[model samples]
Target: DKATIPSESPFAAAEVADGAIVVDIAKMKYETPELHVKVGDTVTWINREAMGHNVHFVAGVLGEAALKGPMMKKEQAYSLTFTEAGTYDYHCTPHPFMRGKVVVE
Candidate 1:
C-alpha cells in the first residue's frame, strides 16, 4: 500500500519540468512554501483546496502596489512571470493564515 502522493511531481518522483516550477495550494497551506527562481523563469501555483485560493501579494512582497491572482475556485492555477530579481511575499486572501515566499535571482 502507498499514500496518495502526487505523481509526476518534484521531490516525490523527481519529475521536475524542463523550466518552470510547480507549487500546490492544498489543505489550506502552500506546498513548497518557499521557492527560488530566475527573472525569466516562470512559477506555477496550483490550487487543490476544496474551498478555493488565490495568490495575493503586497508591500514587501510586491515591492510596490499589490499583485494578485484571480479566484482559483476549486482546482485552478495561476502563472506568474518575474521581471526583476527579489523576494516576493504572498498570502491567501480568503485564508489569511496561509503564506508563501518566492525568491528571484
Candidate 2:
C-alpha cells in the first residue's frame, strides 16, 4: 500500500491537527489534498475561489453515507463529521479534477 513507502514514496497521508480540519477550495486544487482524522472528527471545506463550487462525495468510495453540498459562494463552507472508520474521496461537482480525501481511523 501507498507505493510501498520509504524508497519510492516519502509521503503518507498526514493526520489533521486537533479540532476541525479546514480545506480551502481555491484555484483548481484542494489545498492539502489529503487528510486523516479520527472517526468522530469533522472537516470543513471553505470556498475561497471566485468560482462557485460544491463538495459531492464519490459514490461507493466512502461507503454508505452520502454527502452533497449545494453550490457554495466565496467565504461559505460545508462541514461533514465522519462517524465511520474509512476513507472518503470527494471533489467539486463543477470541476471534478479538484479532488481531495478524508481518511478516518
Candidate 3:
C-alpha cells in the first residue's frame, strides 16, 4: 500500500491562512491532505481535538522508533525537517493502522 499519514495520525498542520500546515484531529486521519515539502520546510502536527496520539516512525529493517506522548487536552505539536530527499513513513502509536508519509525534495 502507498504509505499514508493515517487520518487518525496525531500530527496536523496548523491554521495560518498563508504557508500554514494544519491537520484536523477529529476526522480520524492525518490532517494534511498532501504532504510534499521542500528540504527546509518544517512540517508540524498540532493536536486540535481532546485525544492522545503518538507520532512514530514505522519499523524498517532495523526497528520502529515510537515517538509517544500524552493525551493532549490543549494543543500539542511536533515539527520535523526533511533534510534528505526521501520518503518518511510514520504512524500513530494509539492507532496502529493510521499512517502518513512525507516526501521531501
Highest TM-score: which candidate? 1
Q: Rate the local accuracy (lDDT) of all candidates.
A: 0.68, 0.66, 0.55
Worst 10 residues of 2 by lDDT: 1-10
TM-scores for every predicted model: 0.76, 0.74, 0.64
- What's the TM for model 3? 0.64
Task: Write model 1 residue lDDT over 53-105, tens digit each, in one string.
Answer: 77788744554556656667555666676767878888888887999988989
lDDT of 2: 0.66
Ranking by lDDT: 1, 2, 3
List where candidate 3 sits over 4 angstroms from the true fold: 1-24, 59-73
Tell me which of candidates 2 and 3 scores higher on TM-score: 2
